[PDB]
């Protein structure tokens, strides 16, 4: 169904735009035409939330969204993210000096052809690992805060953050969404999802099917089979019923998968099936 993200209601089945680019989200996509077709069909299918970034393929993913969908329905929310830059070797690097965050915000503005960004995710990176790690984010957020006052950005969100960081952030500005790694097999954020929900802040999982062990994978497959669904559909449907503040942004460069992902809304998970799925992580 729906969720109010900032001041705009969004269909909880949205679209991640990260597959509309070359391998490693770098360079142009396989086929620009199919990318355009996928975006247009998504809208036609009821998508009104698109997740993107200007460091996808540097810039080209945003330009495709523009070529395909400008001028945008005013029902449409485009969410983008800043905080990283791309090496010319496809590498992802820290990019959170005021100059870089300001340039990133304007890059988005130009490539999407917008006058203001709906939602900007600040994407955190601490330590030498990849995921959530402790450290103050005040400096970056203050910069995003100022561009909000200037009217370049309506709403601020967070990406790849620990519960403490969210807590530090929410004293500097309003946070409308948190975007973290989370799926059936990786449920460390469970507590935060419920707490966010109670404050009306959305939570946005990525890797819906990522990093499953064979046993984890075969269980999901078993469940799909018995339901006449695909594993992807089961994964999305589980996310949908897990909490009402959860927004899905599955990415795909294929129209068939798009329609299939969107069909996941029709799938209804019995208690016995949820029992099996909740045990995948345990
Ligand atoms: N903020 C961050 O730190 C960050 C990091 C990662 C992702 N994200 C966002 O989150 C979104 C989701 O990305 P993700 O990393 O969670 O992974 P994902 O986009 O859900 O997975 C992408 C892969 O799944 C395949 N796929 C999609 N639907 C399928 C289906 N129905 N059947 C079989 N395969 C299917 C795609 O292949 P096909 O193209 O051939 O269908 C593609 O190879 C992204 O679009 C991006 O915007 C953000
Ligand atoms: Mg993706």
Q: Cα–Cα distance between 248 and 208 in angstroms, integer?
A: 9
Taking a 5 Å cut-off on Cβ, the residues next to ion ligand 2 are 16, 18, 251
User: Using CA atoms, how far apart are residues 124 and 161, in angstroms rounded to an integer?
Assistant: 6
The answer to whether the annotation marks 142 as part of a ligand binding site is no
- Judged by DSSP in three states, 93 sits in strand
- DSSP strand pairing (92-94 vs 84-86): antiparallel
| Cβ-based neighbour number of residue 248 at 10 Å | 24
Residue 18 three-state SS: coil
Tokens of 200: 């009306």
Biggest CA pair distance of the chain: 53
- Are the C-beta atoms of 239 and 248 separated by less than 8 Å? yes
Pairing, β 77-82 against β 92-94: unpaired
Token pair 């099996």: residue: 276
Nearest CA to ligand 1 atom 20: 250
Spatial separation of the C-alpha atoms in residues 192 and 116, rounded to whole Å: 29
CB 232 within 8 A of CB 264: yes
Map tokens 């967070």 to a residue: 158
Solved by what technique? X-ray
CB 26 within 8 A of CB 261: no
Q: Is the CB of 5 under 6 A from ligand 1?
A: no
Atom of ligand 1 nearest to the CA of 233: 31
Residues 6+ apart with CB under 8 A from 21: 27, 28, 29, 56, 57, 60, 61
Q: Which helix (H) or strand (E) holds 94?
A: strand 92-94
Q: How far is the CA of 207 from the centre of ligand 1 (A)?
A: 7
Question: 220 with 208: CB under 8 angstroms?
Answer: no
Ligand 2: centre distance to CA 210 (Å): 10
26 labelled as ligand-binding?
Answer: no
Query: Domain extents for the chain?
Result: 2-211+244-253
Q: Sign of the C-alpha dihedral, residues 137, 139, 142, 143?
A: negative
CB 80 less than 6 A from any atom of ligand 1: no
Q: How far apart are CA 273 and CA 268, in angstroms?
A: 10
* CA 167 / ligand 2 centre spacing (Å): 27
- The residues pairing with 15 across neighbouring beta strands, listed in sequence order, are 50
Beta-bridged to residue 80, according to DSSP, are 52, 120
Count of beta carbons in the 10 Å neighbourhood of residue 172 = 16
For 127, phi then psi, to 5°, come to: 85, -170
Residue 168 CB neighbour total at 10 angstroms: 16
Say if residue 207 carries a ligand binding annotation.
yes
Q: Which atom of ligand 1 is nearest to the CA of 257?
A: 31
Collapsing DSSP states into helix, strand and coil, what is residue 42? Answer: helix
Q: Is the dihedral of CA 158, 41, 4, 147 positive or negative?
A: positive
Q: Residues 185, 280: contact at Cβ < 8 Å?
A: yes
DSSP assignment of 113-169 equals T-SSEEEEEEE---SSSSS------HHHHHHHHHHHHTTSEEEEEEES--HHHHHHH
Clarify whether 203 is annotated catalytic.
no
State the Cα–Cα distance between residues 216 and 185, nearest whole angstrom.
Answer: 7
Yes or no: say if 123 and 152 are a contact pair by the CB < 8 Å rule: no
Q: Ligand 2 mean position to 54 CA, how many Å?
A: 15
Contact assessment for residue 258 and residue 41, using Cβ atoms and an 8 Å cutoff = yes
Q: How many CB atoms lie within 10 A of CB 273?
A: 17
The verdict on domain 2-211+244-253 having CATH code 3.40.47.10 is no
CA dist., res. 261 & res. 259, Å (int):
6
- 144, 152 Cβ separation under 8 angstroms: no
Closest by Cα among 78, 168, 79, 162 to 125: 162
């Amino acid at each position: 169904n729906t969720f109010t993200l900032g001041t705009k209601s969004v269909n909880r089945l949205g679209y991640g735009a990260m597959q509309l680019a070359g391998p490693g989200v770098f360079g142009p996509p396989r086929d620009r035409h199919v990318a355009i077709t996928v975006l247009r069909e998504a809208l036609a299918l009821g998508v009104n939330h698109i997740d993107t970034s200007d460091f996808y393929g540097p810039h080209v993913t945003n330009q495709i969204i523009r070529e395909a969908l400008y001028p945008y329905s005013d029902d449409l929310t485009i969410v983008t993210k800043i905080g990283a830059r791309r090496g010319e070797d496809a590498s992802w690097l820290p990019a959170f000096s005021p100059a870089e965050l300001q340039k990133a915000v304007h890059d988005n503005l130009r490539n999407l052809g917008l006058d203001v960004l709906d939602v900007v995710n600040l994407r955190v990176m601490m330590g030498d690992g990849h995921g959530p790690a402790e450290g103050s984010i005040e400096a970056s957020l203050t910069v995003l805060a100022e561009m909000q006052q200037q009217g370049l950005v309506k709403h601020i969100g967070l990406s790849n953050v620990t519960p403490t960081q969210v807590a530090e952030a929410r004293k500097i500005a309003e946070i409308v969404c948190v975007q973290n790694e989370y799926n059936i097999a990786h449920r460390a954020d469970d507590a935060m999802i419920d707490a966010l929900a109670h404050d009306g802040i959305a939570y946005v999982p990525f890797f819906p099917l990522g990093g499953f062990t064979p046993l984890q994978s075969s269980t999901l497959s078993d469940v799909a089979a018995s339901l006449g669904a695909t594993p992807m559909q089961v994964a999305l449907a589980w996310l949908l019923q897990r909490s009402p503040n959860i927004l899905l942004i599955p990415g795909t460069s294929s129209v068939a998968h798009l329609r299939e992902n969107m069909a996941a809304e029709k799938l209804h998970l019995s208690e016995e099936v949820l029992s099996t799925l909740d045990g995948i992580s345990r």
